[PDB]
């Protein structure tokens, strides 16, 4: 498969919106396996992110933070290995996305079935729905001994229920294609 190298920018503000998006597009276009951390930060509402759509594996951690963009197209992401972790604890960190209102509306991690190491931190995403419905224990791998969670569900909009097609009312978004594969 096509591999790319990840970043280690964490929450630092980029030097320029243009050079930032250009760097991410050139890094991840066509990429399937990120050998490193997938950090997606400070992206504005009009950001074109189709270049992420082939990512299937992240070897480090995924950080989605300080974005106004309403969707992040990671529907093909199947595994986060967590060989590096955000704050040495979290394999998936979704932070401060927000503030039509800006801000991530759904995670839409339809293919995510395994986190091998590290936990899940979801904080201060005022338009984010459904993150409380996910059974994270079905995603943490059996040898993941940092399977800790903090899922902030405070939000500023009312969420429509998971699709009635979804078993156990667990979903990554409103669509019947967004049910959690359990």
């Amino acid at each position, epitope marked *: 498969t096509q591999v790319c190298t990840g970043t280690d920018m964490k929450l630092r503000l980029p030097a320029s919106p243009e050079t930032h998006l250009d760097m991410l597009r050139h890094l991840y276009q066509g990429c399937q396996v990120v050998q490193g951390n997938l950090e997606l930060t400070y992206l504005p509402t009009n950001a074109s992110l189709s270049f992420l759509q082939d990512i299937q594996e992240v070897q480090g951690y995924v950080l989605i933070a300080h974005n106004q963009v309403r969707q992040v197209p990671l529907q093909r992401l199947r595994i986060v290995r967590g060989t590096q972790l955000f704050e040495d604890n979290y394999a998936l960190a979704v932070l401060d996305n927000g503030d039509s209102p800006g801000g991530l509306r759904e995670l839409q991690l339809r293919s995510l079935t395994e986190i091998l190491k590290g936990g899940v931190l979801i904080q201060r995403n005022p338009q984010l729905c459904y993150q409380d419905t996910i059974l994270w224990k079905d995603i943490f791998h059996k040898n*993941n001994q940092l*399977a800790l969670t903090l899922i902030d569900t405070n939000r500023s909009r009312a969420c429509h229920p998971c699709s009635p097609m979804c078993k156990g009312s667990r979903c990554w978004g409103e669509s019947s294609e967004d049910c959690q594969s359990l």
Partner: antibody
Amino acid sequence: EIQLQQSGPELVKPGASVKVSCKASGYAFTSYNMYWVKQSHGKSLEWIGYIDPKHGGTSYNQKFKGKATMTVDKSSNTANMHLNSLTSEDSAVYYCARMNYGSGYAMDYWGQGTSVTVSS
Amino acid sequence: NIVLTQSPASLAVSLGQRATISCRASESVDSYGNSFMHWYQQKPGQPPKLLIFLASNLESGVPPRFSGSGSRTDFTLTIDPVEADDAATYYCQQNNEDLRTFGGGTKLEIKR
């Protein structure tokens, strides 16, 4: 040197709640997870859960879900464990212990234990 | 849940002899080239103290009379030579899964 200083022994009535505190010093408190562990008298050690002080992520033993709640107070470098709805079977020594990532998540520094007596 | 079974539950060893304590796990505690097995000493009325981490690593400050060996489902703590200060209960503990579990403990009586 690293020290974990726990609050003193507690006498609590059945049905009440108790707060056990664990004050950390000698290292960066928010850089390490904190384990909580139960030991009934003459029995083995049981894992209750662990917490990340920096962002508050937690992992609980299912056996203690809803008996124990872990929190931190960063300003005082303190981890706290609240035990609720107490029964005779909750009378035990409760320990906090630091998680060491490099040492395979071993419990490398322990508090001195807080003895809780549940009784009328 | 990985169940840890320590053997023997108690033993009496004289000063200068070797003490051997075994920890048998119900399934492998190995992953990513690590054995996630640790050993602790608990004297009566005290907290446990870490002796050995990751099956064979001696914790800094612990006397080299203590050693750990083993892999997969079978681990051993050796104390050689036994000294009076070793009177204590010894526990193994694993974290190859998020659910941490401990052995039932082995009580070491010093034979004088």
